Amino acid sequence: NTEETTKARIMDVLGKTGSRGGITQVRVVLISGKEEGRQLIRNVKGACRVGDVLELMECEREARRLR
Amino acid sequence: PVKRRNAGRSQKNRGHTRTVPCTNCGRQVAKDKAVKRYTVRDMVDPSSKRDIQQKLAFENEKQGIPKLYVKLQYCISCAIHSRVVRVRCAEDRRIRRP
Amino acid sequence: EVISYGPPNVGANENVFGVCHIMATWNDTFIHVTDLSGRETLVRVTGGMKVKADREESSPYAAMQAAIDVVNRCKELKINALHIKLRAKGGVETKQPGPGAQSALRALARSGMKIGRIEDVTPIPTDSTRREGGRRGRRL
Amino acid sequence: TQPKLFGKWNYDEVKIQDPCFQNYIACTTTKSQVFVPHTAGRYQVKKFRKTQCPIVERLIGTLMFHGRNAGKKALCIKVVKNAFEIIHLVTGRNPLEVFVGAVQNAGPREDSTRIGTAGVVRKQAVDVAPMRRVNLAIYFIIKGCRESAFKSMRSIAETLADEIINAEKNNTQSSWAIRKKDEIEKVAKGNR
Amino acid sequence: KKGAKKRTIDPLSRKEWYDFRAPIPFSSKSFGKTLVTKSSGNRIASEEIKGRVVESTLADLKDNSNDKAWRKVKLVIDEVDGRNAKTSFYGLDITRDRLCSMIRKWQTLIEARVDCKTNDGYIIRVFTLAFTKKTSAGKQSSTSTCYAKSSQVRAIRRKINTFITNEAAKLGIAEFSKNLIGEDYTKKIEKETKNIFPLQNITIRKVKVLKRPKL
Ligand SMILES: [Mg+2]
Ligand SMILES: [Mg+2]
Numbered sequence: 001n002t003e004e005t006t007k008a009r010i011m012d013v014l015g016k017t018g019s020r021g022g023i024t025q026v027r028v029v030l031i032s033g034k035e036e037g038r039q040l041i042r043n044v045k046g047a048c049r050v051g052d053v054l055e056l057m058e059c060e061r062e063a064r065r066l067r
Numbered sequence: 068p069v070k071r072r073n074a075g076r077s078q079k080n081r082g083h084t085r086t087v088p089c090t091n092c093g094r095q096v097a098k099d100k101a102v103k104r105y106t107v108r109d110m111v112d113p114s115s116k117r118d119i120q121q122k123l124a125f126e127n128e129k130q131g132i133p134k135l136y137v138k139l140q141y142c143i144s145c146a147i148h149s150r151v152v153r154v155r156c157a158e159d160r161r162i163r164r165p
Numbered sequence: 166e167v168i169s170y171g172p173p174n175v176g177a178n179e180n181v182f183g184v185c186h187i188m189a190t191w192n193d194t195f196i197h198v199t200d201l202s203g204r205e206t207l208v209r210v211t212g213g214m215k216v217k218a219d220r221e222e223s224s225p226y227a228a229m230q231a232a233i234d235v236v237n238r239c240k241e242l243k244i245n246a247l248h249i250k251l252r253a254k255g256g257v258e259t260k261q262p263g264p265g266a267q268s269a270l271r272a273l274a275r276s277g278m279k280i281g282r283i284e285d286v287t288p289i290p291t292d293s294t295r296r297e298g299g300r301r302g303r304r305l
Numbered sequence: 306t307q308p309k310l311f312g313k314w315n316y317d318e319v320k321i322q323d324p325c326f327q328n329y330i331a332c333t334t335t336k337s338q339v340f341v342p343h344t345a346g347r348y349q350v351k352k353f354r355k356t357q358c359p360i361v362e363r364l365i366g367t368l369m370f371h372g373r374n375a376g377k378k379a380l381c382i383k384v385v386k387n388a389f390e391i392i393h394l395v396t397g398r399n400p401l402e403v404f405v406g407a408v409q410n411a412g413p414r415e416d417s418t419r420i421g422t423a424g425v426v427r428k429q430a431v432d433v434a435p436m437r438r439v440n441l442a443i444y445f446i447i448k449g450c451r452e453s454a455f456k457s458m459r460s461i462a463e464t465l466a467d468e469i470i471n472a473e474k475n476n477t478q479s480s481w482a483i484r485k486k487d488e489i490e491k492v493a494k495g496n497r
Numbered sequence: 498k499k500g501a502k503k504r505t506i507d508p509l510s511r512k513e514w515y516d517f518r519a520p521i522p523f524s525s526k527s528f529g530k531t532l533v534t535k536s537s538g539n540r541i542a543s544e545e546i547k548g549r550v551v552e553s554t555l556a557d558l559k560d561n562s563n564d565k566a567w568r569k570v571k572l573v574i575d576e577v578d579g580r581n582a583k584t585s586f587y588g589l590d591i592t593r594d595r596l597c598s599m600i601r602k603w604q605t606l607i608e609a610r611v612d613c614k615t616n617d618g619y620i621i622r623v624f625t626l627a628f629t630k631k632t633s634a635g636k637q638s639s640t641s642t643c644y645a646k647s648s649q650v651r652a653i654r655r656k657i658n659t660f661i662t663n664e665a666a667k668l669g670i671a672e673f674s675k676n677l678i679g680e681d682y683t684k685k686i687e688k689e690t691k692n693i694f695p696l697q698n699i700t701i702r703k704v705k706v707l708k709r710p711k712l
């Protein structure tokens with residue numbers, strides 16, 4: 001099991017999505033070996049504040065919407 | 068009774084206007100009537116351009132990626148349903164370019 | 166060692182050019198690479214070669230894999246820069262690029278690749294010919 | 306002087322290396338260093354209080370969860386104490402520095418959100434939060450214990466003990482917990 | 498592990514390389530490279546690439562070439578000097594950026610098609626692109642009209658084409674191509690035209706080599 005878990009933290013909590021009205025969309029900042037600094041807009045699920053840290057198992061993403 | 072003055076279209080002099088196929092259903096619609104909105108589309112999403120700029124190659128006249136040119140033509144029938152133009156209220160029906 | 170075939174000329178300051186054609190339909194996606202004369206095919210990766218379900222023969226994922234698959238093959242051709250000719254069954258069809266479009270490019274840039282000039286070559290016609298469906302078209 | 310857990314388990318014997326869990330766990334606080342896992346605290350009041358809960362209090366809670374049989378922390382504090390003694394007698398390590406690791410491992414990092422449109426059941430790629438991650442981890446760990454623990458002479462303090470151990474190891478063949486931890490990510494990595 | 502692939506006999510084995518080069522007023526350099534299949538007795542190495550055609554953006558001069566990088570020049574391998582591809586003029590064009598670029602909905606669009614005769618024993622077809630220009634500070638609105646009576650339109654065609662057929666009858670393809678890419682004709686047309694109706698964004702949309710003698 002050789003994964004590329006790049007650790008990234010929450011920059012800004014955008015809004016809520018998925019009419020399941022439970023998913024959260026967040027802007028991230030990275031801190032890991034590979035790149036770092038790169039900002040992504042990822043989709044979380046669950047309790048999340050500003051500044052937490054989340055292990056992304058795929059930096060090539062960033063789906064998005066705001067309407 | 069009558070709902071509109073232009074009934075949705077702009078044919079004001081002539082008796083007949085060319086028909087055109089719908090960007091979405093393919094349906095035939097008279098030019099003048101059908102909705103239009105020729106837009107200046109962009110090749111890549113926001114944060115996604117920067118990624119292609121650094122790994123870019125050729126010269127850099129600061130002219131970036133060519134922007135996509137989409138000439139849009141919708142027929143009423145689907146134009147509506149497609150969030151384009153929402154059923155507007157009574158007096159707002161005469162408002163042009165809000 | 167390896168027996169590359171790119172012309173006998175290296176140089177971390179000597180750019181190689183390969184013309185990458187990309188057709189993005191709402192069903193399938195294509196990624197092609199060829200001489201700047203486009204008469205000798207090199208690399209050819211389509212979403213179909215990348216997944217099982219016919220519906221995914223388009224996908225953003227299929228574009229990533231078909232894209233990264235080409236870049237690897239390209240470093241071996243000794244080519245680093247690619248010209249892009251982007252299309253989308255212009256003919257009498259939605260002259261709009263598919264989905265696996267912005268996805269394919271993105272993958273080539275990320276996986277290294279240098280990008281030459283970029284064109285849009287969806288064949289817009291002057292006239293036209295009776296489209297898909299007829300009179301009323303896809304209904305439902 | 307330092308108040309050891311159950312009277313024999315230094316809290317400072319552990320540290321949270323990863324930054325993720327640093328605020329989403331209890332070992333770290335002065336207030337957290339408790340002799341007993343019973344605080345009849347008032348967590349679950351604001352919308353993030355749960356945090357300040359001494360990790361094991363949480364374990365005990367999630368543990369007394371099956372209907373009729375449960376609802377009495379009194380006992381559960383036990384099943385967890387014995388389980389800690391038992392985990393120690395095997396790896397002789399500060400069993401918190403075990404349970405803790407297990408908590409960090411058994412938490413899925415990815416899940417799929419069911420978003421269906423007109424009958425078709427589609428899913429997307431979702432990154433699992435920290436608070437949610439820990440919650441899932443414990444819920445999972447315990448979830449399994451009962452699995453075997455049923456018509457077995459094996460006891461929860463034993464089942465649980467045996468679990469917390471492998472859960473730290475990532476032993477995908479000995480932890481009903483980590484099985485899902487992997488599968489959820491796998492299936493999720495498919496739907497994504 | 499167990500790979501899913503393994504390289505056995507590359508297909509690009511019997512491949513020879515070449516260099517793109519065309520005199521005319523374009524740099525001596527060997528911009529880009531081509532590719533071909535080895536000879537085979539019947540097949541003659543450098544000899545299949547005869548009717549080859551390359552589309553090139555202006556980076557075929559080091560100077561102000563990166564700027565004017567929208568003229569798509571199309572060239573034909575006309576001769577090969579061992580490992581080198583020599584090329585003559587075949588076609589001249591533009592791109593979607595520019596074409597769709599200058600296209601506003603309150604002006605007029607004009608086009609002039611022309612069949613020129615060069616003393617070189619060469620036949621051309623040159624397409625011109627004209628647009629009417631405002632002159633009142635009013636940014637073209639639904640209220641601003643910059644149309645030009647169809648009589649004035651053809652008035653320009655008649656004038657434009659007539660200017661170019663004479664321009665070609667007096668030049669060498671090497672000179673003509675050089676001139677066509679240059680803002681020389683943009684200025685000339687601008688001169689004859691302000692007489693009929695002030696234009697803007699004037700262009701030579703496309704040029705096709707109709708019939709090129711090989712004396
Ligand atoms: Mg009629
Ligand atoms: Mg006027």
Ligand SMILES: [Zn+2]
Pocket residue numbers: 089091092093094141142143144145146
């Ligand atoms: Zn329609």
